[PDB]
């Protein structure tokens, strides 16, 4: 179980690259697993996996913010973004360079 795949992640960690908001919304939002060999698209089957809990997609910070107000605009702590508006999504924070 844990030894299969990356041992840190309970669910498959799918980071979201900065594919965004450059051509009719850029529906081909780039989802990349922790393995990183493949580069998938956000098809409804990936959403089925994500709601199944087997995978979990995460937004990074140090990049052009990915449709940050067009995907979802809940900004209570700036990290309340959800895809199907009832997702309970989690954002990865990186104040890498802006902090001392």
């Amino acid at each position: 179980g844990p030894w299969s795949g990356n041992a840190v992640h309970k669910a498959e960690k799918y980071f979201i690259t900065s594919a965004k908001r450059d051509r009719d919304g850029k529906l081909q939002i780039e989802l990349v697993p922790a393995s990183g060999r493949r580069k998938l698209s956000p098809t409804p089957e990936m959403i089925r996996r994500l709601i199944d809990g087997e995978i979990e997609i995460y937004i990074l910070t140090t990049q052009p913010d990915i449709a940050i107000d067009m995907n979802k605009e809940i900004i209570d702590m700036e990290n309340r973004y959800v895809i199907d508006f009832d997702k309970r999504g989690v954002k990865w924070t990186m104040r890498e360079i802006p902090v001392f």
Binding site: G1, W3, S4, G5, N6, A7, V8, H9, E12, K13, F15, T17, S18, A19, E30, V32, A34, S35, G36, R37, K39, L60, T62, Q63, W92, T93, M94, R95, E96, I97, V99, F100
Partner: protein
């Protein structure tokens, strides 16, 4: 009859760190050359509750890749972005496997 000659001796970059995932162990600091000093501790609160994390100064950090190639991160916060944009928690993650156990009926493990 005739054959040709043979010889055969065989026989006889822009690395980032996710502070949400980072736990503040600082092996990146040990893996960084002292002349650069890219890895640095940032303190948030009580040390025993996670407290300080680590950060990279992008301008100072110039494509050494020692941190990630060392593969010393326990938390997987040390990430590498690629020119095409893929992100790597680890250099080589083990493959995901469909796990289900084996029990022979007549063997002693049944």
């Amino acid at each position: 009859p005739v054959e040709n000659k043979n010889q055969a001796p065989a026989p006889g970059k822009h690395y980032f760190i996710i502070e949400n995932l980072c736990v503040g162990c600082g092996l990146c600091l040990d893996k960084c050359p002292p002349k650069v000093n890219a890895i640095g501790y940032k303190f948030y609160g009580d040390v025993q509750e996670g407290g300080f994390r680590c950060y990279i100064d992008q301008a100072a950090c110039i494509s050494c890749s020692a941190c990630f190639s060392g593969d010393e991160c326990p938390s997987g916060a040390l990430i590498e972005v690629l020119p095409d944009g893929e992100v790597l928690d680890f250099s080589y993650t083990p493959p995901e496997r469909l796990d289900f156990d084996l029990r022979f009926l007549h063997r002693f493990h049944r």
